[PDB]
């Protein structure tokens, strides 16, 4: 998929 699970991180920026 285009999506990739962050494995527990609510956000990344």
């Amino acid at each position, epitope marked *: 998929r*285009q999506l990739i*699970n*962050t494995n527990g*991180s*609510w*956000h990344i920026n």
Partner: antibody
Amino acid sequence: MEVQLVESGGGLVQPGGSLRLSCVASGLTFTNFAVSWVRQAPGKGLEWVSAISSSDGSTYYSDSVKGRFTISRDSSMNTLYLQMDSLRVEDTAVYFCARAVVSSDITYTYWSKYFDYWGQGTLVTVSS
Amino acid sequence: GGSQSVVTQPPSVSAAPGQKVTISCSGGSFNIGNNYVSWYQQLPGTAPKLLIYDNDNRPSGIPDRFSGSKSGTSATLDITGLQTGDEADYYCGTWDSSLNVVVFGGGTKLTVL
């Protein structure tokens, strides 16, 4: 084994006062998931409030609770909390603990954040 | 009293047992337009439960008469073979890249009659 996300600490309080909610997971893991608190005011819809990352412990808040609420976890690894200070009547609501599945594309622009399990919730009433 | 929502849903939907029902969510570019939608069932006095995730996926214990789709800044939840046990409040949910919160639709009360 029963599967449970139990919240507690809800109660009646005067505006300006404070309360601490806790959410305890049983029969489910927090490993590889984030966790959020979502509330529902009297007769209204669901409103996201705050979240914590199980990975690095990063914390996040809606603008309406910033500076007043504090989300945290302890070494049990299956428990989180929501300290609520300087409460306001509009903070009145049932507070749900909900496990979040988080994903994004490689450029961190497109996001998928959904809640795959929720607790029955705890009621918080702020009024004089 | 009355108000406006970031993501809008009809206040109520109704149909007789066996019929089809559709609930839509209308948002903007920063929420439904660019992010993934999920749907929830909140039974009276009950913990909300996930029905659909990432626009059209169904979690393991959810019957296929529940389905979701996304188009533009809009999303839809389809429920066929309506049953009395389906009475509940339904919410779509999505990240909003502008407000930086997971926004939930206003909610739709499903009555089966």
